[PDB]
């Protein structure tokens, strides 16, 4: 029986990974910042009903705190924490702590001497910010060779520049570190993630995809900004993301970084689908009518080439269970 | 040096296949119904400059005429192109000749004794007609397991029913014949094909993708019909189709049938692109506004996970050279 560690077990993606690992016969260790907070971590008790699940305390700013959690693990899933709130000095407050915290966990992985592979969950924040491709007014198909432009982001500091710079640098630093220390590191890069997970206090990762239904002003702004940039948005079901992370840990030939994406609708298509299937929220699809814009899209083909198969392939399947989750979280009123 | 036969050398797809094969170092044999008609075959003289190209007279409707062209070949590219003349009895004027013409050439392949693989060019006409799915209000991703409903098509005879039936039945029959004689048959299923080819008298294969520029009422009706059915159209560059045919010929593990597609725009996306890239034609994108419909799309992934790579990936790249071809053919008035 193989053993896996999932960092950030209180979070959206972390909780979904733990569920899949248990269902697949793994013994799981997970880290949280306060194991006694059973309002935040009640799902970890439920999940113990599926297989061996051990909870540990750990924090990214606390050097070595991940030692006991990763020890004995065949695979380690590093789920990066979402930034959450802005900062006066993003370099000192966000970017640098993101690098350091990632290395901190890397070190606990070498020290375990048992980790066959580390799967880093990042996002396409590290892929898409290309001043040439986004700005030249032509369509483009990006892939895993594309990296967000750190120099341009620091020069002009557009909104979310710090989320993108921190993802790029922490991935590069973790790769540099995995090189010098002989540990296999594979990175996955999700688009907007959709679907239910066990975590009771998730939100950040769910606001964008439900914002047409909720009216969340920040969410809608984000979807519109992505569409203004790229001509569309990109979505993937959380269960396919989780299956992809498992796939990448278990298949020895997997190497480097992988975009994880399945459906790329315009907002009017998405709004139209949501209005038809969930009319109780009064979505007006004409609120998202827009000129057709050049499409700048992230290719999904690398994961496909390696033999992975997505299970949520239509728009409706990608949204198959997220609405009931938004209800339970209070993101939606009913 | 391997040798290959390409049927329908005066045709759009046949001529582009010959070009690719010569460039890639094959000796090539091709068939045309009248090797003298230089209206139709002037390109063959030109193509002979690229490598060893030999021309034969043959006719689908004439048993054995393909024997000479196919002899000695390692690969045969069965480009089933010419259909019929919609008469009172499509089952005897179109469907049956299509089947028998295909089996005619397959027999030459058996007689040759040398043929390691036959690549049949069909179309997603043999894939998409799924009345159990086209009106159910949901999206669907169809793949190579989906076949057009021949029974339903014969029962209700919607427009172009016999076209779809011809394609389904000749593919079924050719595969049955191939299995009986232990010959390798692989079928490729293009969507709408875009791009220049050597053939100086092609037309029907290019009218549709040029129809918003030419205003061809038949082409435009076809496009609107596809979009009312599937909520989008699907396009592929002729050069990727030819490279995919060669890929399927050369890759031993290739097996069965393969959708070939790369871009799936709405008509309003396509018209916006064309209007901006080619304003001299007067396209009005609002002529193609339409409500969003559930998407019924053909999966591209079988070819992808077998190792093939498309080179024309954006909408602009798929349209990189067809307008000049259209001007040359007279499809476009200027
Ligand atoms: O920087 C990114 C990545 C980007 C993205 C997603 C999908 C897509 O198709 C293109 C870009 O989305 C985001 C969404 C957020 O709430 C915050 C972010 O920082 C970002
Ligand atoms: O539905 C069809 C049928 C096919 C076709 C063309 C001509 C004809 O006479 C019959 C069928 O062309 C297509 C091309 C597409 O990208 C998507 C489609 O859905 C289709």
Author numbering:
A (entry chain B), B (entry chain A): 11 to 344
Which statements did the authors publish about this structure?
Dihydroflavonol 4-reductase (DFR) and flavanone 4-reductase (FNR) reduce dihydroflavonols and flavanones, respectively, using NAD(P)H to produce flavan-(3)-4-(di)ols in flavonoid biosynthesis. Anthocyanidin reductase (ANR) reduces anthocyanidins to flavan-3-ols. In addition to their sequences, the 3D structures of recombinant DFR, FNR and ANR from sorghum and switchgrass showed a high level of similarity. The catalytic mechanism, substrate-specificity and key residues of three reductases were deduced from crystal structures, site-directed mutagenesis, molecular docking, kinetics, and thermodynamic ana-lyses.
